[PDB]
């Protein structure tokens, strides 16, 4: 179906403990494929997926050059943001950037992204039109003015519509064994007595890829949204993900409850019941 490529970047200042730490990672869908950490002994961008390893020395040289330049630019930007927000040089601050693209089943661009945050809050974002900016505050407006003057949006558009789509297409082909395989959830329901009066029914989804999934509980066919404990989708460590949804059920009412599972790896949504 549809696919995405994203590069994530984080710089964290640490006054008195050297220069800001820079960590960047790249993803295609929910698969990590490249990483760079400025605190590594000999910082280079490193492969994290088999299908990127085949890229030649010049690929890794260019990537590493970009990562190092980005770390440097982020350092200067952190200094700039202290001025923009009238902040002292004493505290730790964070700068985050993500850009990338989504493509449809036919490999066409669905949309591009480029967006920054400072200290965990939205700062400036390229709009969907890939031509205009949303600035969060009067500080980001200073950046917006500079970026409008330098026609930054135009440059980003060229990359997002061009390379970004083209290299994503390449990666999807080279990693077609994994990137184009959905692993469906392995599902079951467990029962956990709480008291004489009630028990927890927990609906499990395990071993699935990609991470996107819907797990819901119904009682007599009615969604139990406000009564369902739904944990965040979590990594297993083997590329796959896990999730559960739990409801507290009165004694003897178990069969009135059904768990419903939607995942792209499933041809039809599943319905599960507690089976003693």
């Amino acid at each position: 179906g549809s696919h995405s490529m994203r590069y994530f970047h984080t710089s964290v200042s640490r006054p008195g403990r050297g220069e800001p730490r820079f960590i960047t990672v790249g993803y295609v869908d929910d698969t990590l494929f490249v990483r760079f950490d400025s605190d590594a002994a000999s910082p280079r961008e490193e492969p994290r997926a088999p299908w990127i390893e085949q890229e030649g020395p010049e690929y890794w040289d260019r990537e590493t050059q970009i990562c190092k330049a980005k770390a440097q630019t982020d350092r200067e930007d952190l200094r700039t943001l202290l001025r923009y927000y009238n902040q002292s040089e004493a505290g730790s601050h964070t700068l985050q950037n993500m850009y990338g693209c989504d493509v449809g089943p036919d490999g066409r661009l669905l949309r591009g992204y480029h967006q920054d945050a400072y200290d965990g809050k939205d700062y400036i974002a390229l709009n969907e039109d890939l031509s205009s900016w949303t600035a969060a505050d009067t500080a980001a407006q200073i950046t917006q003015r500079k970026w409008e003057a330098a026609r930054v949006a135009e440059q980003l558009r060229a990359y997002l519509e061009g390379e970004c789509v083209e290299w994503l297409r390449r990666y999807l082909e080279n990693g077609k064994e994994t990137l184009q395989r959905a692993d469906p959830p392995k599902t079951h329901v467990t029962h956990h007595p709480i008291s004489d009066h009630e028990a927890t029914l927990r609906c499990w989804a395990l071993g699935f890829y990609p991470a996107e999934i819907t797990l819901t509980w119904q009682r007599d066919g009615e969604d139990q949204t406000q009564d369902t404990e739904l944990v965040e989708t979590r990594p297993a460590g083997d590329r796959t993900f896990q999730k559960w949804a739990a409801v507290v059920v009165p004694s003897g009412e178990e069969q009135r409850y059904t768990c419903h599972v939607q995942h792209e790896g499933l041809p039809k949504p599943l319905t599960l019941r507690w089976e003693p």
Binding site: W147, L156, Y159, E163
Partner: peptide, 9 residues
């Protein structure tokens, strides 16, 4: 692969 150009805030 990553974008080559970049710009200061």
């Amino acid at each position: 692969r990553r974008k080559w150009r970049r710009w200061h805030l």
